[PDB]
Design a protein around this nucleic acid. Sequence first.
DNA 1: ATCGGATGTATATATCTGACACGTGCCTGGAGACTAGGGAGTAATCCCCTTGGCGGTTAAAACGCGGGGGACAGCGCGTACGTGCGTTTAAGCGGTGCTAGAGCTGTCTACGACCAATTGAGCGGCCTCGGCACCGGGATTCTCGAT
DNA 2: ATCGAGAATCCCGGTGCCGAGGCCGCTCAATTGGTCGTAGACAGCTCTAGCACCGCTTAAACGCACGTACGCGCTGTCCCCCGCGTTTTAACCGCCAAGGGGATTACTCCCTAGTCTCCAGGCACGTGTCAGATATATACATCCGAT
Lengths: 93, 94, 148, 83, 82, 109, 108, 76, 85, 99, 99
Amino acid sequence: RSRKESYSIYVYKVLKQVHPDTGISSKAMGIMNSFVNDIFERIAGEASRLAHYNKRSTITSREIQTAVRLLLPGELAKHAVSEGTKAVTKYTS
Amino acid sequence: KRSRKESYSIYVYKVLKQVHPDTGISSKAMGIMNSFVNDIFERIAGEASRLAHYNKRSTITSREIQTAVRLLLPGELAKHAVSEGTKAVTKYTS
Amino acid sequence: HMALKRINKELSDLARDPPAQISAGPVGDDMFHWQATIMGPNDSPYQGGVFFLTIHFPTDYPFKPPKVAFTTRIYHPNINSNGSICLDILRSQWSPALTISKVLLSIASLLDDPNPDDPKVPEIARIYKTDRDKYNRISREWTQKYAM
Amino acid sequence: KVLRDNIQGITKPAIRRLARRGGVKRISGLIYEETRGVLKVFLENVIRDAVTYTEHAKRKTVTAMDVVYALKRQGRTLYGFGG
Amino acid sequence: VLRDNIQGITKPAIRRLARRGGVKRISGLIYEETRGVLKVFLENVIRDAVTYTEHAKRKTVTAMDVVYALKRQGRTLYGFGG
Amino acid sequence: SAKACTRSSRAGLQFPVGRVHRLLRKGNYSERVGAGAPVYLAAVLEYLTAEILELAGNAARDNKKTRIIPRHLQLAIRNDEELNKLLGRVTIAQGGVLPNIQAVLLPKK
Amino acid sequence: SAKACTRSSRAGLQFPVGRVHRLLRKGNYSERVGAGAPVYLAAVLEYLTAEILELAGNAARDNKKTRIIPRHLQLAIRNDEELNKLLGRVTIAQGGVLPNIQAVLLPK
Amino acid sequence: MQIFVKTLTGKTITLEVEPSDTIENVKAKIQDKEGIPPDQQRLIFAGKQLEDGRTLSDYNIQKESTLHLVLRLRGG
Amino acid sequence: AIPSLSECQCGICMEILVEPVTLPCNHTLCKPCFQSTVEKASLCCPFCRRRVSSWTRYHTRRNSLVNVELWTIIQKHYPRECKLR
Amino acid sequence: KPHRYRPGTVALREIRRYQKSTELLIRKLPFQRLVREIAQDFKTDLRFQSSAVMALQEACEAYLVGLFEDTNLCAIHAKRVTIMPKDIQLARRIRGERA
Amino acid sequence: KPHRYRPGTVALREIRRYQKSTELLIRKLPFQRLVREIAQDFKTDLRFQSSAVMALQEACEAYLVGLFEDTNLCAIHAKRVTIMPKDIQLARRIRGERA
DNA sequence: ATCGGATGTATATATCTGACACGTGCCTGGAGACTAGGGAGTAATCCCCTTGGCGGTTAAAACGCGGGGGACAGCGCGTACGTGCGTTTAAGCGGTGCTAGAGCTGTCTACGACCAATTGAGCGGCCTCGGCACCGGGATTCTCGAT
DNA sequence: ATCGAGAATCCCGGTGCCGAGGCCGCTCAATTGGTCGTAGACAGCTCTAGCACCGCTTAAACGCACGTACGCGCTGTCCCCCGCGTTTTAACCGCCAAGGGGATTACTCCCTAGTCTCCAGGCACGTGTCAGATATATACATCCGAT
Ligand SMILES: [Zn+2]
Ligand SMILES: [Zn+2]
């Protein structure tokens, strides 16, 4: 057989972190996988276009931040930027 | 002097002289044609790159470009563009 | 197949009224292969020049152009040593309505005067555009020792 | 094994059911033919791209991923079938 | 500083746009709605334009930023670059 | 940070970071990929997933169930304002539609 | 075809094969680019450009002008079903709109 | 004095020359016998390209030394 | 009147017209030659060298390439020529 | 003597019931036969995965539901409760599907 | 005694005139000032290239012309000749700009 | 404004079944250490173009008035669609059999990436003359009040 | 059905100006030649599931009849855009002047790709059990005719 990667265990961990009691079915799990893939592809493509637009050749954190500010609506954009910068700051030290 | 900026101006002018032997074209129309060519190039190249990534391939072969042309263009432009591309490749390889 | 009949009419057209200073014919049984002889035009630096060339007919004619090659040696900016010829009608401006007589007379016209916009050989091209006399005498000691 | 006039399989009660889900109280008598035509056009548009996708890969069975991908290209992203 | 400038989109300047669009008769309340929707559309485009400008550590909104924002929104524009 | 634990645990994230890095490398997005991009991207993905899961769990608890079915996801996405705009073009399988009837069609008083 | 001549003329095209090849290779589309892709892509682009320009020139001649201007481009694009379908969302600067008045508004 | 050369065609042409001769003159001799112009000729001595200005004795060409030839093919 | 027998033959294949196609540049050639040219030639009229691509795109959807009246004339007036095809 | 509802309340009850459920609203076999007919019209001798047919049916049902919602909005805007083919045509024209 | 055109024959003349020309319809400086106001609302002390302002004006004019075309179509559908705010709202709702 | 049937929907209880949550083997992908070089950060300079200001002139906007055409409400007709019942049709479910085609593995050969010398295609700057903009006069054609 | 006056639009001829097309100098990117590592083309084998058939329920579809309520045409009222004339406001053009920051260049350093080694995190497979669906029997909200 061939191993097929997925975001299953991580989404289950997040669900248990938020709602320790409720479960999740298989169809909802596939829907969440598709949603995560779609958002990933959108943000990565926007970051790539932004990097190419400024005659650059790398994707740093700021390109991802600008892509997030472009894509997500207002309040979601602010919360996502705050979470991302917090994670990067905690990671770098 | 100013750094070199590339454009499709001279080739579009050559094609225009090939179609209409005695018709000129303004600057704004040149800019519009340049933008149109760039946009279509970006569309076809991006679709072909995706479709190559789709089947775990690594090369953008003329098959991928042909499929992207069949997808993006409408009914008749698809057939004519495919025929022209096949003609060009056949004449180039031999 | 269908091109064989077209070759028949082209041969008949060459037969009834052959053009001036040029004559072509098939070497063997197959009508695809042809060879032709061309004289040096009077208003040219190739006086008394005799040249031979070969013609290849693709299986899809006239929808595709035929191939030409100089089996002899000639000095010209638009012809290489091996005999390859770079003219517009051969590969870029070829149409099915054209005939072998037309391409032969176009070749003769090129031999009358060169085309400097698209030189196949650039060194003799800059030699020719430098001054006329150098091209003159180089064509001299090329044509009276190769053509004759 | 040819097929004919299978569009009649989308009967009047089925279109009535769809409109009832949509939020429609009263339905005219000429809606059904228009609905069938619209559905046929949409199916042709999606299936052409799906068949192109499954033909580029040198296969003979259309895969659900191909349909998902044709829908995504056409502008109607679909969730729940992979990707 | 500027304030109360949406009134610059004058009543004849909206009548002319409607005339180009193919409108024969115009009600007396169209102008306010048109001003509102125009302001919303401008705000939506200019936000992305300013974000593009701010990313490049610049201070001038070039035409390329506006063209890129319009292309992102799905309203591709021809003539000013690309 | 400590620079001794796993990368995902080091950043405080539950989503993988190495997998995101590999996807960025092999995704043909840029010739080079920075060392801080995967962390930011994983944080954004995890936040969005957490928010949608919280709303779906709220809907499921409202409907007296212990599992999240696609209907709960559809309700959670549509009822919110930001998420609905984000997923405006997305169609959820087995999602149905929100209950709304125009006021004109209702019977008169 | 015989080698030892510029690439754009080997296939009979006018658009630059080399420039298209460089753009495809360094444009960050795929790891490797085949040797036949640029020729096909250049042929498609040249075909489309010729299609646009022929109709634009026809409209310009119909307008008693010997120079193509964006109004002629818009008239050529919007009067063809296939091209209008292709360039649906695109806005041509200084292109105007097609003449069209609804029959109901006409005087009776 | 004859020289063995592995040309592109592989044919070795017998001709009496001397190492003291210049490259231009031997190239002209080849053009007289083989027709290849001096610019088109490119003699190869142990993988080294010889300039036309110099002579054969500079790279020490000896009796029947196995050399190579490549034609500078531009066009055709 | 009636067209001459010699003038009617195709200028490409030197033989009678079958399913003739009338170009917008009022040049007539038989459908096999026209199809072979559009497949392999430079998408131009061989004689006057003008593009027919937009015309071909328009006419191929409605299947109006063939000239019905000239085809009827050639088959009725010269049936044996069509039979020997 | 027999009790029959006023014309209209049954439609409202069906609307309320049908906006709560999530199953599919078209019979499986006729839709499968129709999609097979279209496919074999495009390319002969084709085979279909079951999931592909299910995905096609789901997409078509969602699109039709959205179209009917827009048509109902148009019909109510025209000071009517019934939907007519001109409502569907206008909705398609505004959405830009047919231009 | 003075010659007055009937109400209706002048608007059609304006429609015929404006659908043939291509110049910009809104005045330049008021539009530029409004754009600068919005920009300073977003970020303070910005500068604008004239090409950017022209592009913004072109996009806005094209969008408004399209919106008025759809509004007129809806108004004609509603058995009227006058365009009303509800027409604009319905066209925007169907096009998906506000839902 | 009720009041009675009568109908459909909502609620409480047993049960049983298949999908979800968890446990285990393992192997492939991720982590750790080290090296080289180019991409990007930073400082400095130039000059392009953006902002600001004045004066004029005049095309466009603001305001007001008379009125006619269009929006909107009210009524009446009848026809098409909703609701219910009996009947015919084929969807739905289970069970079995067959093989075409998806999927995986092993060889290896030819296509594409890399690098260096080289030169001509294409870009920047100049210049000029013709195509288009503009003005002024006249011919042509819709428009409307009056017959 | 029409004739004619007032007004807008199209044609034609002459003058002028600025930008589009061609030319010259030059620099750098495409070309050509050669080498090398690996991607996919092909042959072969496995085995999954897509297709075809058959029988039995019974649920959804179909056709018909009755009635009513809503779509549509018609009329009447009134009020609000429209067309035109007059006055006020600021847009547009040409002009000058200052400097901010975009664009380019040189230098350096440190951040990431590439390679090798190693090991454990996640995937495939298997198993138990309980959450939800279904059947069955009451309780209540709601609708419609009749006072
Ligand atoms: Zn013929
Ligand atoms: Zn012709």
